[PDB]
Design a protein around this ligand. Structure first.
Ligand SMILES: *[C@@H]1O[C@H](CO)[C@@H](O[C@@H]2O[C@H](CO)[C@@H](O)[C@H](O)[C@H]2NC(C)=O)[C@H](O)[C@H]1NC(C)=O
Ligand SMILES: *[C@@H]1O[C@H](CO)[C@@H](O[C@@H]2O[C@H](CO)[C@@H](O)[C@H](O)[C@H]2NC(C)=O)[C@H](O)[C@H]1NC(C)=O
Ligand SMILES: CC(=O)N[C@@H]1[C@@H](O)[C@@H](O)[C@@H](CO)O[C@@H]1O
Ligand SMILES: CC(=O)N[C@@H]1[C@@H](O)[C@@H](O)[C@@H](CO)O[C@@H]1O
Ligand SMILES: *[C@@H]1O[C@H](CO)[C@@H](O)[C@H](O)[C@H]1NC(C)=O
Ligand SMILES: *[C@@H]1O[C@H](CO)[C@@H](O)[C@H](O)[C@H]1NC(C)=O
Ligand SMILES: *[C@@H]1O[C@H](CO)[C@@H](O)[C@H](O)[C@H]1NC(C)=O
Ligand SMILES: *[C@@H]1O[C@H](CO)[C@@H](O)[C@H](O)[C@H]1NC(C)=O
Lengths: 388, 388
């Protein structure tokens, strides 16, 4: 989508995976979906170093609105959970130099049972969001037919533009259509959306992450070519800092999402996040690679019988990123190979930096053998710069 | 096995899961299987508070011996990796008030390719181990037929007794025979072994733990009745502190192994263990419940459609232990029920202590509703004492 936005994958926080549709603010004041949740996450992003790293979006997901539109047919937030309205929430977030994202559903109902954005409501809702000061909109697709979606998604892109307010547009259209051609036309998506959810919702478990990793890389031929500045593939939220991932697994998700040029939308409680989880999510070099200006999504290039997978992502400044991933469940594994074997130019030399450890290799020749030790369900990630 | 040993499930450290058959001491001085590994783990157990809690066994697993017996037909440790011999290692461990465990295989070869204990070598090997000062022996079953195992396992029990040295005897016999009756006779196992590996080796992943949990509880009817002081079911090593389990998952394994009256044999690097992992493994109340004098293995009593499972273990002093386990992957879950609904006596009251948080409930009436909040892949564990 050529609206000057999302020239790099969107970075921020999104409520869904971690908080879901919790409306029990009486017993879960901090974990329930309310204006307070977003204001506090905004303070967290603004105060704990996240903002400086690039994390700027504070996104509201499903279950924020009243169970019905007002009499005028407009969407309104839940009165008890959002007593100051959305515009006020936006100002608050804006005052911190952050941006506010909201959620809607192209259909009769949102997946959670809240007011849906039917075709006759698209222009009005887009208008309502802009007036509130919204900066990003995720449009879900429950309760709408393929025909209705084919009309509605492009229609909402036009409506958003008409408001004159630049709004990042995240589309779930592909996921509802199976995520693959011919049913999905990624060329069209690139023209109308800034990013799109291609596949299943991420759940809080390592197997969920693996399921997403495997679907995207198995189908990379029909997905990788359509990602770029202004239009990204979205494998869903980062679940680092939550309940299901071990330390190694957490680093694995961050590394693989970076290879995929995926949005870095955290869905975790920033008020209780652990130091190790924070350290992973705040890795500057990792973020630099994810945010690379060229926006060329990487690919899996090797699947060893040793249960080791290798990924490569081409970058700006003639650089590259490599991820060595172990799916073994026995012990740290010694993977030995050479850049030449991985496909790099002959007779060259590279300065290599281990993204997580910081260790550097001054001048690795492409013909030289090297060994990396990868832990179970973990990765070793390299940033490579050619010497001249 | 009535040898006065293992009146409570064995507690200690075992090398296998974490270190496997690593013999590359040149590049992995600390992680390779050598006398140094065991001496250092012994120092760890003796110095970091483990010994006082009950952890006393330091067990050697596969890959410790020379590739062949000496000329006299006796087992000898690998010369380079165990330069001071086993007896010296035992003395060292003994000097710390700990005990040394060793590994052997009833067959032509150990699963790792090391010298096996064939039938004609049983008496000699049992003799060799006693002389070295061995305190525990795990007898694997690779490369032996069912007929040979039926003869060898009982035969080794007799050989060990004859040495006059009390030796905990861990038998893998059932695992090789499928772990279920009629092929396996757990009454016989109770007579000849102190503990037995009934099922598959644990690997470093949550799915491995779940696979073990599900097999044991699905088949609890033919397993639970045969566990007791002196003879236990062994679901394998604790992998808390390693690469594949998240924090919640780690607590889940500890809690479920405690419900199963399982041996608490840690297989992790005690030199680098995290504070949180250490805190889980050193939980005194948890250990007290695992070590309960009655030795009555618990059972799964409920499988909700909410993906919540409930476990109960009867204890001494008319007490009980309950585990509420969530296999959901969405968010913390509120499980509401009553002790009456769980099956407890009517019109009674209990003092309840949350094993992990320490929070206490003074006098919970069996008829009163209560709610516990369980995190994804996590547990809530209670210790209950009746009031009078
Ligand atoms: C509506 O669409 C127009 C283009 O159709 C957007 O204008 C483009 O903005 C980008 C970045 O600001 C420029 O690089 C292009 O040159 C512009 N194109 C044209 C035709 O001028 C405009 O930003 C959109 N409006 C909103 C609010 O999204
Ligand atoms: C060999 O077996 C005998 C029993 O057959 C063991 O002796 C028993 O030891 C326990 C605990 O010390 C006592 O409770 C029993 O009363 C003993 N039984 C008998 C018949 O005396 C003996 O400990 C075993 N020897 C070894 C080295 O394991
Ligand atoms: C593909 C897609 O957008 N899925 C969304 C999910 O992310 C979340 O927003 C949920 C809220 O109910 O609704 C849909 O399942
Ligand atoms: C059931 C059983 O004992 N399995 C063992 C395993 O625990 C480990 O000792 C390994 C060493 O090679 O051998 C067997 O697979
Ligand atoms: C996909 O959409 C683009 C953009 O509208 C269009 O040019 C192209 O023809 C479509 N492809 C197919 C197979 O319909
Ligand atoms: C490099 O390592 C590979 C093993 O992956 C080996 O086959 C090859 O012979 C090595 N090359 C040299 C020059 O040692
Ligand atoms: C199981 O072993 C015990 C102990 O030797 C024996 O008494 C019993 O008969 C055996 N059960 C069967 C079915 O063979
Ligand atoms: C106790 O909670 C259950 C829900 O599990 C509910 O059905 C029941 O009515 C409650 N009992 C009382 C007295 O509130």
């Amino acid at each position: 989508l050529e609206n000057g936005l999302a020239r790099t994958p969107p970075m921020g926080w999104l409520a869904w995976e971690r908080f879901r549709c919790n409306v029990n603010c009486r017993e879960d004041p901090r974990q329930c979906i309310s204006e307070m949740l977003f204001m506090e996450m905004a303070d967290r992003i603004a105060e704990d170093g996240w903002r400086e790293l690039g994390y700027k979006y504070i996104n509201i997901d499903d279950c924020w609105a009243a169970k019905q539109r007002d009499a005028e047919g407009r969407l309104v937030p839940d009165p008890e959970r959002f007593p100051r309205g959305i515009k006020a929430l936006a100002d608050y977030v804006h005052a911190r130099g952050l941006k506010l994202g909201i959620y809607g559903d192209l259909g009769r109902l949102t997946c959670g049972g809240y007011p849906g954005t039917t075709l006759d409501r698209v222009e009005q809702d887009a208008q309502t969001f802009a007036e509130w000061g919204v900066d990003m909109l995720k449009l879900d697709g429950c309760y709408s037919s393929g025909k209705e979606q084919a009309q509605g998604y492009p229609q909402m892109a036009r409506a958003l533009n008409a408001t004159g307010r630049p709004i990042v547009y995240s589309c779930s259209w592909p996921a509802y259509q199976g995520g693959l051609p011919p049913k999905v036309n990624y060329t069209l998506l690139g023209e109308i959306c800034n990013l799109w959810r291609n596949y299943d919702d991420i759940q809080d478990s390592w197997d969920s992450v693996l399921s997403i990793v495997d679907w995207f890389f198995t189908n990379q031929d029909v997905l990788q070519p359509f990602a770029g500045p202004g239009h990204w593939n979205d494998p869903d939220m980062l679940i680092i800092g939550n309940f299901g991932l071990s330390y190694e697994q957490s680093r694995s998700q961050m590394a693989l999402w970076t290879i995929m040029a995926a949005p870095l939308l955290m869905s975790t409680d920033l008020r209780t996040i652990s130091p190790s989880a924070k350290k992973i999510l705040q890795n500057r070099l990792m973020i630099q690679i994810n945010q690379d200006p060229l926006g060329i999504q990487g690919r899996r290039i090797i699947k060893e019988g040793s249960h080791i997978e290798v990924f490569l992502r081409p970058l700006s400044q003639a650089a590259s990123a490599l991820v060595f991933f172990s799916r073994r469940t026995d012990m740290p594994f010694r993977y030995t190979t050479s850049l030449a074997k991985l496909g790099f130019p002959m007779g060259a030399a590279y300065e290599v930096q281990d993204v997580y450890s910081g260790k550097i290799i001054s001048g690795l020749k492409t013909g030289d053998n090297f060994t990396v030790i990868i832990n179970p369900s973990g990765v070793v990630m390299w940033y490579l710069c050619p010497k001249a």
